[PDB]
């Protein structure tokens, strides 16, 4: 209907077909031999396919299959396409465009690369732009975005190296003869192994874009007008490229507190993952998941770590679970400067560039009680949130609407206030800032634009995992948010402590690993939120997110048989409610 109007207008190269028709197969192999990529809509596979056939005549004047369209215009039936192919005209017909590209993606990260690769699959001439603006100290990286270079990938690899520290401790209890005195961790050796894998990913994306015929440009993009993108390369050469559809996926960069010596002497997560020297005695300022994750693995790798907290841990997360995360960290070598804020950072030593050793800094601050903070640290890491930098990316005259935070205000299909311009990932306002979210949004948007899809990205009940020393996985609402939304009387919380079987012989803690189901009483005990603290929390939580998406109830958890022995099986036998007052201990 109107779907067909939007499909024809937006698709670069699309073929309307039936799977049974011989003429349709004839065109398919001709396009395959000529190496012309395209989208295919099989009308016999659709419920309203007969109605679409009738509506094609509003664009083509014919109601039969096959029907080939290029960039809003009807190209021809079976004989017409074969006419172009025999006369060697077909290549010029399919390349005919108003702009240099069908899609220009500004930002070669999680969402950007996912949108770029998916679009090229349906014959959209795609160009991806990626530029890494160096950190204050001069740290830069390759193609892949935050997650690949300075995010999930190097974070969880260092989290794993920190997990091995306690695997070495457990091994002795499990019978392994080990001299843990004379066992130390080499930071630089780990970094080299981490950066070697990131390098293969940087190279992996370059090859993938080359294989998908996507034009990769290592350049700073700037959308001067709806269709024009200004590019500045490595040589500072300035030029303009044009594109029909524009996808903004520039992401975010870490924030610095406005205090003397922060930019000059302190570092962020951007610098940490490729740091040529061991941080040593480290102060982490912030209470985000980035702050606790970074401070977590540094302490496990034998580092003297202190976390400066202004007010609370993990703002936005479940505060009962956030406390349990912090309690485990505090009991396992992580110090906390509670109710404290920094005032200034002053240098005592410059970073040893040749010996690869950290400098020395003295951090002056103050507690809420009036007491002064004055302690020396070899490395100061700032993790006080991240911000979009779209003032560098958009000229205000284009008309792309931003919120008070500087993030793009988008519709449910990622459309900006400029119709051809779209925004995905971290810069999309009000959306869960995660890697899979950006990739899902990028792929799905690319399918709607060029393949005539209707499927939108579901941003509700997106499961997360904080990779702290003891991992915390969550899917849905926090207990406090569910109570605020529906009232305390409409909320039932089933909970229980558990101990991994691995922890028993290892002589690790009882009643520390914890899980809960936040349920709505009036809605057949609907699971509103799932929360789990324990090892492999990401692997545990994932499967339940599919069930919660389908509208899982407590009864659905009860009728499902557990797998023994696992940590995740405790979700199936939950019985203790919070309202009963019965202790959740094992």
Ligand X SMILES: Cc1cc2nc3c(=O)[nH]c(=O)nc-3n(C[C@H](O)[C@H](O)[C@H](O)COP(=O)(O)OP(=O)(O)OC[C@H]3O[C@@H](n4cnc5c(N)ncnc54)[C@H](O)[C@@H]3O)c2cc1C
The smaller minimum CB distance to ligand X, of residues 68 and 115, is found at 115
The smaller minimum CB distance to ligand X, of residues 45 and 405, is found at 405
Binding mask 486-525 for a second copy (x = CB under 8 A): ---------------xx-xx--------------------
The smaller minimum CB distance to a second copy, of residues 26 and 499, is found at 499
Binding mask 150-189 for ligand X (x = CB under 6 A): -xx--x----------------------------------
Question: For ligand X, which residue of 76, 123, 145, 388 counts as binding (CB under 6 A)?
Answer: 145
Catalytic residue, from 166, 185, 531, 564: name it: 564
Torsion sign (Cα): 163, 164, 165, 166: positive
Nearest-CA neighbor of 388 among 421, 339, 441, 424?
424
Q: Give one DSSP letter per residue of 415-469, joined into a string.
A: B-SSTTEEE-GGGBTTS---HHHHHHHHHHHHHHHHS---PPP--TT--EEE-SS
The minimum distance between CB 479 and a second copy, in angstroms, equals 20
Whether the CB-CB separation of 210 and 113 falls below 8 Å is answered with: no
The minimum distance between CB 13 and a second copy, in angstroms, equals 21
CA 181 to chain centre: 39
Question: Does residue 536 belong to the site contacting a second copy (CB under 8 A)?
Answer: yes
Other CB atoms within 10 A of residue 200 CB: 9
Question: Does residue 34 belong to the site contacting a second copy (CB under 8 A)?
Answer: no
Residue 173 labeled ligand binder: no
The minimum distance between CB 180 and a second copy, in angstroms, equals 10
Question: Does residue 473 belong to the site contacting a second copy (CB under 8 A)?
Answer: yes
Other CB atoms within 10 A of residue 553 CB: 17
Question: Does residue 546 belong to the site contacting a second copy (CB under 8 A)?
Answer: yes
Q: How many residues does the chain have?
A: 586
Three-class HEC string of 74-117: EEECHHHHHHHHHCCCHHHHHCCCCCCEEEEEECCCHHHHHHHH
- What separation in angstroms does the CA of 57 have from each of 65, 79, 572? 11, 17, 56
Range 82-141, binding a second copy (CB under 8 A) = none
Q: Provide the 3-class DSSP secondary structure of residue 154.
A: helix
The smaller minimum CB distance to a second copy, of residues 91 and 546, is found at 546
Kindly state the DSSP code that residue 227 receives in the 8-state scheme. S
From CA 507, how far away is CA 512, in angstroms rounded? 13
Kindly state the DSSP code that residue 538 receives in the 8-state scheme. H
Q: Are strands 379-382 and 386-388 parallel, antiparallel or unpaired?
A: unpaired
332 as an active site residue: the answer is: no
Range 480-539, binding ligand X (CB under 6 A) = none
Question: Does residue 434 belong to the site contacting ligand X (CB under 6 A)?
Answer: yes
Q: Which residues are annotated as a binding site for NADPH?
A: 155, 287-288, 290, 310-311, 315, 385, 433
Interacting residue ranges for ligand X, rule: CB under 6 A:
106-112, 129-132, 145-147, 151-152, 155, 220-221, 249-251, 269, 290, 392-393, 425-426, 433-436, 438, 564
* Residue positions annotated with a catalytic role: 564
Q: Which residues are annotated as a binding site?
A: 18, 53, 65, 78-79, 110-112, 130-131, 146-147, 152, 155-156, 220-221, 223, 250, 253, 286-293, 310-311, 315, 385, 389, 395, 426, 433, 435, 481, 507, 558, 560, 564, 572
């Amino acid at each position: 209907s109107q779907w067909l109007r939007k499909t024809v207008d937006s698709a670069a190269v699309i073929l309307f077909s039936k799977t049974t028709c011989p003429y349709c197969k004839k065109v398919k192999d001709v396009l395959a031999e000529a190496k012309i990529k395209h989208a295919t809509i099989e009308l016999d596979q659709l419920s309203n396919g007969s109605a679409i056939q009738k509506c094609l005549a509003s664009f083509s004047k014919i109601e039969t299959v096959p029907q080939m369209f290029v960039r809003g215009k009807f190209i021809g039936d079976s004989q017409t396409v074969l006419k172009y192919y025999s006369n060697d005209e077909l290549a010029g017909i399919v390349n005919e465009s108003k702009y240099d590209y069908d899609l220009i993606v500004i930002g070669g990260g999680s969402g950007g690369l996912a949108a770029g690769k998916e679009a090229a699959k349906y014959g959209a001439k795609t160009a991806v732009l990626d530029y890494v603006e160096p950190t204050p100290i001069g740290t830069t990286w390759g193609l892949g975005g935050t997650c690949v270079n300075v995010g999930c990938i190097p974070k969880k690899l260092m989290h794993q190296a920190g997990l091995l520290s306690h695997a070495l401790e457990d091994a002795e209890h499990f019978g392994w003869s080990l001299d843990r005195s004379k066992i130390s961790h080499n930071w630089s050796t780990m970094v080299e192994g981490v950066q070697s894998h990131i390098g293969s990913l940087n190279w992996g994306y370059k090859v993938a874009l080359r294989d998908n015929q996507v034009t990769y440009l290592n350049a700073k993009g700037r959308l001067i007008s709806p269709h024009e993108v200004q590019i500045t390369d490595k040589n500072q050469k300035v030029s303009t490229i044009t594109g029909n559809k524009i996808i903004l996926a520039t992401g975010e960069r870490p924030k610095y507190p406005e205090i003397p010596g922060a930019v000059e002497y302190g570092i962020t997560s951007d610098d940490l993952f490729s740091l040529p020297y061991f941080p040593g005695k480290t102060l982490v300022i912030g209470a985000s998941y980035v702050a606790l994750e970074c401070a977590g693995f540094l302490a496990s790798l034998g580092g003297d770590v202190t976390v400066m907290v202004r007010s609370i841990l993990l703002r936005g997360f479940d505060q009962q679970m956030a406390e349990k995360v912090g309690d485990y960290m505090e009991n396992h070598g992580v110090k906390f400067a509670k109710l404290c804020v920094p005032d200034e950072i002053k240098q005592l030593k410059v970073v040893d560039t040749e010996n690869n050793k950290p400098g020395l800094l003295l951090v002056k601050g103050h507690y809420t009680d009036g007491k002064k903070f004055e302690e020396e640290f070899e490395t100061v890491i700032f993790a006080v949130g991240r911000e979009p930098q779209l003032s560098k990316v958009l000229c205000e005259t284009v008309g792309v609407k931003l919120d008070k935070n500087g993030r793009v205000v988008c519709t449910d299909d990622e459309q900006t206030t400029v119709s051809n311009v779209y925004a995905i990932g971290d810069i999309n306002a009000g959306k869960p800032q995660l890697t899979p979210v950006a990739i899902q949004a990028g792929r799905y948007l690319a399918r709607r634009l060029f393949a005539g899809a209707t499927e939108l990205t579901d941003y509700s009940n997106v499961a997360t995992t904080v990779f702290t020393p003891l991992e915390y996985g969550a899917c849905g609402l926090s207990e406090e948010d569910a109570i605020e939304k529906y009232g305390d009387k409409d909320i039932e919380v089933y909970h229980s402590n558990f101990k991994p079987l691995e922890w028993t012989v290892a002589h690790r803690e009882d009643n520390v690993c914890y899980m809960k189901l936040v349920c709505r009483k009036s809605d057949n005990m609907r699971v509103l939120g799932l929360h789990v603290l324990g090892p492999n929390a990401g692997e545990i939580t994932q499967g339940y997110a599919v069930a919660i998406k389908m509208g899982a109830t407590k009864a659905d958890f009860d009728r499902t048989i557990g797998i023994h022995p696992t940590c995740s099986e405790t979700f199936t036998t939950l019985h203790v409610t919070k309202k009963s007052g019965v202790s959740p201990i094992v």
